[PDB]
From TrEMBL:
MgtC-like C-terminal domain mapped to chain residues: 9-85
Native source organism of the sequence: Mycobacterium tuberculosis (strain CDC 1551 / Oshkosh)
Coiled-coil intervals: none
Protein's UniProt name: Mg2+ transport protein
Family of this protein: Belongs to the MgtC/SapB family.
Compartments (UniProt record): Cell membrane
Full-sequence range covered: 141 to 234 of 234
């Protein structure tokens, strides 16, 4: 089965590694309750005291207000430097 009914969105949040721990858990619990399916989360150190969690998600339907709320919550975690979501798992800037 192909997924062209679940739009790939990548949510990249740059936060402290100490935050990454609860942020990554927060991502998986939010997505599973928000009708968002996960592809995987690419977590990598990208700076000095920061790690960028790039969560590749597929959202069924896509309700922007939900995704935005989750992104705001991810940013709401104490330790986030920045967060941004982009459409396309592979960052498809077409």
């Amino acid at each position: 089965v192909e997924d062209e009914g679940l739009q790939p969105y990548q949510v990249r949040v740059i936060c402290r590694p100490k935050a990454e721990t609860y942020v990554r858990a927060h991502i998986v619990q939010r997505t599973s309750s928000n009708d968002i399916t996960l592809r995987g989360i690419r977590t990598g150190p990208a700076g000095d005291d920061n790690i960028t969690l790039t969560a590749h998600l597929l959202m069924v339907g896509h309700t922007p207000a939900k995704l935005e709320r989750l992104v705001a919550e991810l940013s709401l975690q104490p330790g986030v430097y920045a967060v941004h979501w982009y459409a396309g798992e592979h960052a498809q800037a077409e």
